[PDB]
């Protein structure tokens, strides 16, 4: 097998078991990792579902490659303890992550400089008796707080709101959209899908700015 | 990590072949002398041909077989180079080419050829079998590794014995080592590989459209010899005159009529050395049993 | 003292040594100073990279720590300022176990240090002092202490111990300790007793060794 | 279409180094000439399928010289010959009071491979020496071509064993054998063996009538234990060679 | 025991071929003009290969650079749909494959006039689509197209063919059914000559056939580079007759 790790004897197996509008909620914390220059802590708990995750910043790191006019972002999603999302399922989100911050970050302030983003999908409850799609907007919030902690030039507190398998990311207090994500749902529910996302965005950004300006 | 040799030194050996000389003191078609010595363990041997030194090790343990061949036991050969044997080499590069050129040979020389009965590793079908292991170590290179590892593995198989077994469903009774004897293994045929080493004294075209065959082929390139050679060829045979493998993977172009004329000379070489192993296996085991005679009379 | 050694037994390598104690055969190789890689250099001191191959299996984590503690011991042995922006690759081969690799690693750690010490002498690199290592065990049932046990005695051993010392002034002064590998159950009180033989024994080891080096190398030396 | 091309007009070449015979046999290098031996075989009367060919000389070191010769059909039956496949297909030859249906063609086994007297035949030759204590000195495995004296009856051989008149050295080779066949009889049975006796009776059909009405028996005289103890010796000593040659495929 | 019929006593193979016969052999030149200047397509029976060549051009790194000659990269793509039974895992570092990646280099170290292309890169791309056995010599014949497909400097044609042995009898142009049925040898044959580029034997071979066995494949191999030539030439006529 893998000669680099301790994976036990091969013939063992893990243990098996069988059967015998609501509120979302946060707890947002910064400044707790001394390796980084930007850290952010996120608790989430909603109705069957409790979620905690860590966003980590390293920047500006040097680039051994070549010259660029401006900065470059690198984003990692890694499984924590229990929930195991698929590998190719991860990087699609990482693709969707980078597009929004490329309408956020003053890379032109940062020539030949790198951005390292480590996201640790650390622990999630789903006690409910598109499972990754329910965790998208909280990432952007978790990144933004850590990116404020490294103090990097950011245009807006941009945030995403969720309405039932749909993720829409805003700026300008919702007056423009910067990132769009849709799974199955209804048809032409878009206009209501504007709304419930927007107000959570209207909730969340206020929760964020409270976390920093009051500190 | 690069070996540097002058082009002046390059012409020098190339001249020596053009006057039928080679630096070692052998003939062109002469092979080194082989020193085989066993350690105290079974499947323990030190094999030495002048400068090139190797060491290998055979072991076995209990595992289940695959789904693939649920009848048969498990066996594989490790040949991980350490840069101990020469500073050219990476720390355990399993992805280097020459390594693969060492690998696939011994893969075909043993595993696909099947000198060893894997079905005689079946303790119980599908439940418990043997996992037999062959770790090849290189010590110091003067070339001929792939011939040395050809020998030293097949040397090791004829010296390893496995311990005693008793089956009752799950009650699988591996006995103590010293009450119940270890049991040697079943070898279908004994393969011996031969390195061939090739030298154009000319350009490309006199090999290509120069109709005159003019290409020198020798056995067991030494280190300096090996660094200038133009084609690479290894054949493998037995005592029953069958050809195990042939591998000319490119390099210099090469007449077919040479190759048969080459491979016949392989036969007389490998046979004498083979029997030299066969006596020494006996003679050491004779020395084991004469010292076993020097033990029970002693005790 | 059923130990014995060989110097200068490889060809294309700077320093080579076979160390043979009572049951375990181990050879070490030293190549240096040679061209370092990009990711490996130090602007001031000498960079060291160490490879240990087991007898059985391949290089895994069990090997990795025996490597890394051996990294710690050699670093003060080497006059490291003498070779800036350089590299000495050193490589060890376990050939014989002499101890259950599934259950122990004790003797090999004593062995490989005693192996690699001599190939550096073959290598002739600027060094600092003299050294030795022995394996020491304490029996579970008898509650006594044996210097240089065996593997069956390891089975009834309660605690396994490796001591590495730094020897100067004719190798007589304990200049420093290098490694004390306390493993198994032990107290306060055994430990100062546990040094107190190996205080003697490693010097008694080196007392043999000082002879052996000159015997092998003064005929390699010229007059 | 698989039998050798002569018929009953073949002889083995007397020049063992003739170039056309070298062109006939490239492996003639190992074929020795043992036509200069004195060979006689205890056979049945009702037998032209002869398998055995033996001599016994006496070496002046203190011991006898044993050479037994078994027919080299192997020079002619080859893997790829359908006649050898019929050797697999028929499996064997059968032996009845009426007849004897045989695995090989009739010209082949009964004449040109059969070790009959003074006919030039290919055999395989194994050379033993042993002391008066039946302890084997050495054994020598090879091919040869041999020349014989006479194939005996069951009784004609006993007309040469205990007669004490036919006293040439061929018979002094015979009186070597049963002398030490007893030690072979002893030490085989002392090793832990059995010796049963079951005269599976032979119906002596009356030679003037058609259907049988006489019941007779098989009689096992002294000639039987002469040959057999060296045949099982060939079943073991040569086997102790080929196990040392082929440990995994040997029959 | 095989329940089928390997080679008839009436002289025939599975499709009815004789022992000295080939499959249908089709090449093509400039199959992908928009992709690279070396682009050639092979059908040799159902062995179907897309062959692609890039160069002579600048490296990606100055480390991978020489001031004497070219470099040669071999990238083999065995699809998981290449066979009947779909293979589970990918092959991209499989030690079986790397051998061939070594092999074609040393086979083609010595046709390329390496000195007259220094500081530049030759990359040879392989796409194994449909696999029909005879797989090794299938490749080389696709290579010999692709180098000429850009017209790279060379000495000669190079031909490749697997020829198998049922017990006594040579089999030109075996298939994978026959490949698993008997012993086979592939020959990398150079031009019109009797000199070899590739020689590879996996199966167990009795020695005595082998000279005769080697004497077989040359007439096949000469008919290979035969059929490559005119097929290029009738393409080669199609250019200038309608270019001019």
From Swiss-Prot, chain B:
Subunit structure: Component of the RNA exosome complex. Specifically part of the catalytically inactive RNA exosome core complex (Exo-9) which may associate with the catalytic subunits RRP6 and DIS3 in cytoplasmic- and nuclear-specific RNA exosome complex forms. Exo-9 is formed by a hexameric base ring of RNase PH domain-containing subunits and a cap ring consisting of CSL4, RRP4 and RRP40. Interacts with LRP1.
Keywords: Cytoplasm, Exosome, Nucleus, RNA-binding, rRNA processing
Entry GO CC: cytoplasmic exosome (RNase complex); exosome (RNase complex); nuclear exosome (RNase complex); nucleolus; nucleus
SUPFAM superfamilies: Ribonuclease PH domain 2-like, Ribosomal protein S5 domain 2-like
GO MF, any single term: mRNA 3'-UTR AU-rich region binding
Superkingdom of origin: Eukaryota
Compartments, as annotated in UniProt: Cytoplasm; Nucleus, Nucleolus
Further information: Present with 4800 molecules/cell in log phase SD medium.
A GO BP entry: RNA processing
Coiled-coil parts of chain: none
Major localization class: cytoplasm
Record's keyword annotation contains rRNA processing: yes
Family membership noted in the UniProt record: Belongs to the RNase PH family.
Designated name of the protein: Exosome complex component RRP45
UniProt key word rRNA processing: yes
Name of encoding gene: RRP45
InterPro entries: ExoRNase_PH_dom1 (IPR001247), ExoRNase_PH_dom2 (IPR015847), ExoRNase_PH_dom2_sf (IPR036345), Exosome_comp_Rrp42_subfam (IPR050590), PNPase/RNase_PH_dom_sf (IPR027408), Ribosomal_Su5_D2-typ_SF (IPR020568), Rrp45 (IPR033100)
UniProtKB/Swiss-Prot annotation, chain C:
Gene Ontology molecular functions: RNA binding
Subcellular location(s) per record: Cytoplasm; Nucleus, Nucleolus
SUPFAM superfamilies: Ribonuclease PH domain 2-like, Ribosomal protein S5 domain 2-like
UniProtKB keywords: Cytoplasm, Exosome, Nucleus, RNA-binding, rRNA processing
Subunit relationships: Component of the RNA exosome complex. Specifically part of the catalytically inactive RNA exosome core complex (Exo-9) which may associate with the catalytic subunits RRP6 and DIS3 in cytoplasmic- and nuclear-specific RNA exosome complex forms. Exo-9 is formed by a hexameric base ring of RNase PH domain-containing subunits and a cap ring consisting of CSL4, RRP4 and RRP40.
PANTHER family: EXOSOME COMPLEX COMPONENT, EXOSOME COMPLEX COMPONENT RRP46
Note from the entry: Present with 10800 molecules/cell in log phase SD medium.
Protein name, as recorded: Exosome complex component RRP46
Organism: Saccharomyces cerevisiae (strain ATCC 204508 / S288c) (Baker's yeast)
From Swiss-Prot, chain D:
Coiled coil: none
Localization: Cytoplasm; Mitochondrion; Nucleus, Nucleolus
Domain RNB as annotated: residue spans: 31-251
Superkingdom of source: Eukaryota
Function, as annotated: Catalytic component of the RNA exosome complex which has 3'->5' exoribonuclease activity and participates in a multitude of cellular RNA processing and degradation events. In the nucleus, the RNA exosome complex is involved in proper maturation of stable RNA species such as rRNA, snRNA and snoRNA, in the elimination of RNA processing by-products and non-coding 'pervasive' transcripts, such as antisense RNA species and cryptic unstable transcripts (CUTs), and of mRNAs with processing defects, thereby limiting or excluding their export to the cytoplasm.
Quaternary structure, from the entry: Component of the RNA exosome complex. Specifically part of the catalytically inactive RNA exosome core complex (Exo-9) which associate with the catalytic subunits RRP6 and DIS3 in cytoplasmic- and nuclear-specific RNA exosome complex forms. Exo-9 is formed by a hexameric base ring of RNase PH domain-containing subunits and a cap ring consisting of CSL4, RRP4 and RRP40; DIS3 associates with the base ring of Exo-9. Interacts with GSP1.
Family: Belongs to the RNR ribonuclease family.
Miscellaneous notes: Present with 606 molecules/cell in log phase SD medium.
Protein's UniProt name: Exosome complex exonuclease DIS3
Gene that this polypeptide is encoded by: DIS3
Residues included from the entire protein: 501 to 751 of 1001
UniProtKB/Swiss-Prot annotation, chain E:
A single GO BP: RNA processing
This protein's UniProt keywords: Cytoplasm, Exosome, Nucleus, RNA-binding, rRNA processing
A GO cellular component entry from the record: nuclear exosome (RNase complex)
Alphabetized Gene3D superfamilies for the sequence: GHMP Kinase, N-terminal domain
Stored CDD domains: RNase_PH_RRP41 (cd11370)
Main location class: cytoplasm
One Gene Ontology term of the molecular function aspect: RNA binding
Subcellular location: Cytoplasm; Nucleus, Nucleolus
InterPro entries given in the database record: ExoRNase_PH_dom1 (IPR001247), ExoRNase_PH_dom2 (IPR015847), ExoRNase_PH_dom2_sf (IPR036345), PNPase/RNase_PH_dom_sf (IPR027408), Ribosomal_Su5_D2-typ_SF (IPR020568), RNase_PH (IPR050080)
Pfam families noted in UniProt: RNase_PH, RNase_PH_C
Recorded superkingdom: Eukaryota
Chain's role: Non-catalytic component of the RNA exosome complex which has 3'->5' exoribonuclease activity and participates in a multitude of cellular RNA processing and degradation events. In the nucleus, the RNA exosome complex is involved in proper maturation of stable RNA species such as rRNA, snRNA and snoRNA, in the elimination of RNA processing by-products and non-coding 'pervasive' transcripts, such as antisense RNA species and cryptic unstable transcripts (CUTs), and of mRNAs with processing defects, thereby limiting or excluding their export to the cytoplasm.
Comment field (misc): Present with 5150 molecules/cell in log phase SD medium.
Entry similarity comment: Belongs to the RNase PH family.
Name of this chain's protein: Exosome complex component SKI6
Gene designation: SKI6
